[PDB]
Design a protein around this ligand. Structure first.
Ligand SMILES: c1cc(-c2cnn3cc(-c4ccc(OCCN5CCCCC5)cc4)cnc23)ccn1
Lengths: 312, 107
């Protein structure tokens, strides 16, 4: 029940920047809000645990309740958001983390009722404007993760390491935001389907931060392909498929992927109908420059954002 | 568990009970004095209801031992704070915490 002085989450999130004070609510407030949330309905579930829609004082929140198998993701995700000021409109907005009590680990964030891009693409087709808006916003979120910013207001470079359409949410305004920083590195292993060749054949230069950024870029190219399939041109559109759907089984093994990507050197196929639309011709070219076997040759996140901004 | 060092008296008569909202100002620090949070830095009083487990156990016992107006320094051992786990990237594992707390008002 409401009293004079109460704040909404927007107010609580806003008065929260003294350098070192984190992306979410004030550190002592996180627990109190966590324990005042009513959980309502389960909206996702997987090897990571479950996401619930909850409410706090009349507002929707998402609560991720981690499975015991994936506690290190809770710790790392919570540490990243508490240590760093990571606030961007294309990165999922962190609110609070809490452990209860034989023990539940919670990460509470903004709730996106449209759900994941993965589900979004299965339930709808896209036009030029909405396709570009989706892939640009992902590019922007990812460029922001990758960029080091200095000063009292700043953040280190961050690589994600498990970019996939299931870890992208759709906002009501039709832009997306990247979620799930449980594997992120600052300057469990990735989902196998989206692993870059250097991860699959373990030649990744594991002490060069740029290696991890280039792993993100590979995955980002796969997501573009997923998204571009669903843009209609001349009445034609491809059915939603995940990357490598035709050459690896569901839940592919590390070995299945390595054979396809590294030994046989396969890449997702570019539909020929795309070459008669200028935006998909451009997205086609963007994709291919994310999929060089030489990780150094791949486009940066800032360049993709720049290139996508010009297609318009 | 939790030590209460009075820095300035309250009324010595109005102590919070079950179902009361305590309105406080706080500055939380690590054992060596490093500030990790303060409601004074943002000039927004913090509120919690006693007997709902909304706060770490040390805060709940410690503030229950204070009377309105009182400022006191709470030294809270990890079993009554964030335990083995801490709070990643802010409170380390096995942290003793010192909170400077003023009981402004009950509601
Ligand atoms: C990762 C993701 C999230 C997250 C934030 N918002 N959010 C929203 C969803 C979401 C997923 C699916 C949704 O579908 C809505 C309709 N379905 C219908 C069938 C079952 C109930 C809901 C709605 C919302 C999933 N995850 C999140 C939070 C933390 N980590």
């Amino acid at each position: 029940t409401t009293n004079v002085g109460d704040s909404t989450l927007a107010d609580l999130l806003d008065h929260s920047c003294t350098s070192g004070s984190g992306s979410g609510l004030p550190f002592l407030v996180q627990r109190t809000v966590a324990r005042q949330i009513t959980l309502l309905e389960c909206v996702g579930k997987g090897r990571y645990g479950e996401v619930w829609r909850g409410s706090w004082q009349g507002e929707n929140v998402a609560v991720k309740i981690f499975s015991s198998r994936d506690e290190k993701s809770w710790f790392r995700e919570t540490e990243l958001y508490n240590t760093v000021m990571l606030r961007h409109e294309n990165i999922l907005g962190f609110i609070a983390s809490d452990m209860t009590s034989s023990t539940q680990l919670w990460l509470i964030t903004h709730y996106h009722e449209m759900g994941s891009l993965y589900d979004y693409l299965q339930l709808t087709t896209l036009d030029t404007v909405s396709c570009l808006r989706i892939v640009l916003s992902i590019a922007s979120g990812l460029a922001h993760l990758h960029i080091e910013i200095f000063g009292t207001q700043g953040k280190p470079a961050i690589a994600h390491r498990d970019l996939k359409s299931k870890n992208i949410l759709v906002k009501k305004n039709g832009q997306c935001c990247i979620a799930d920083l449980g594997l992120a590195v600052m300057h469990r292993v990735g989902t196998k389907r989206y692993m870059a060749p250097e991860v699959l054949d373990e030649t990744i230069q594991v002490d060069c931060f740029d290696s991890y950024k280039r792993v993100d870029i590979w995955a980002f190219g796969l997501v573009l392909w997923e998204v571009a399939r669903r843009m209609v041109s001349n009445g034609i559109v491809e059915d939603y498929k995940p990357p490598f759907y035709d050459v690896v089984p569901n839940d592919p093994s590390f070995e299945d992927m390595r054979k396809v990507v590294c030994v046989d050197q396969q890449r997702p196929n570019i539909p020929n109908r795309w070459f008669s639309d200028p935006t998909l011709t451009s997205l086609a070219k963007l994709m291919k420059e994310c999929w060089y076997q030489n990780p150094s040759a791949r486009l940066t996140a800032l360049r993709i954002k720049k290139t996508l901004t010009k297609i318009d | 568990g939790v030590q209460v060092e009075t820095i300035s008296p309250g009324d010595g008569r109005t102590f919070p009970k079950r179902g009361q909202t305590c309105v406080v100002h706080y500055t939380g620090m690590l054992e060596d004095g490093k500030k990790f949070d303060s409601s004074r830095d943002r000039n927004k009083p913090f509120k919690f209801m006693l007997g709902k487990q909304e706060v770490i156990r040390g805060w709940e016992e410690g503030v229950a031992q204070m009377s309105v107006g009182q400022r006191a320094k709470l030294t809270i051992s990890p079993d009554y704070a964030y335990g083995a786990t801490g709070h990643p990237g802010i409170i380390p594992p096995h942290a003793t915490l010192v909170f400077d707390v003023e009981l402004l008002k009950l509601e």
